[PDB]
Amino acid sequence: RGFDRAAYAPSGGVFKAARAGRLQGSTSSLTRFLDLPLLPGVDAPEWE
Amino acid sequence: CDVDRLGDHRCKLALGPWQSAATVIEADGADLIVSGLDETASNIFDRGVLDWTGGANAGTGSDIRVARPVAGGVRVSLWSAPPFPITAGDTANATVGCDRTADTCRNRFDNLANFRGFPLM
DSSP, rough: OOOOHHSSSSSOOOOOOOOOOOOOOOOOOOOOOOOOOOOOOOOOSSSS | OOTTTTOOOOTTTTOOOGOOOEOOSSGGGGGOOOOOOOOOTTTTSSSSEEEOOOSSSSSEEEEEEEEEOOOTTTTTEEEOOOSOOTTTEEEEEEOOOOOOOOHHHHTTTSSSSSOOOOOOO
16 A cells, blocks of 8 residues: 655644633722711611 | 635635745655745745646646745645656746634635634634
8 A cells, every 4th residue: 555754744733723711800899988978769778 | 714725716815926936946756845936935835735837747736735945945845745757947836825724814815705714613
């Protein structure tokens, strides 16, 4: 059966790759404390 | 991408400038050294075809597995040895090779209109 060393020599391929993005990054929250006067339309507004 | 073989009607390749004309400086079967090819042409003709106008092949070309520029003109390594013994100085036609990677297709030709590429799924 005919065979060639050159035929078996490697091209090296196309090396295809696909971009991916994964998950989310943790942060320290900037909590803000508010002291507005209590207003109507809010349930139980006394010690809130 | 199905740009694939360049110049396919569905592929609608621009063709034109990339194609080049070359002659063989030396005959080494698969590794024949060629002349008339620019250093820039090498590595762009990688995965290309090297139709030989001269000789029995008469425009039939073994695929160039790898194109690397060397002294004395680019040395072309074909995927397979050419059918029939190829004389040095035989007329040849040099063709670009399309990797078909979507990015490669885009960089070389950018045929968005005819890219059968599905890079992101």
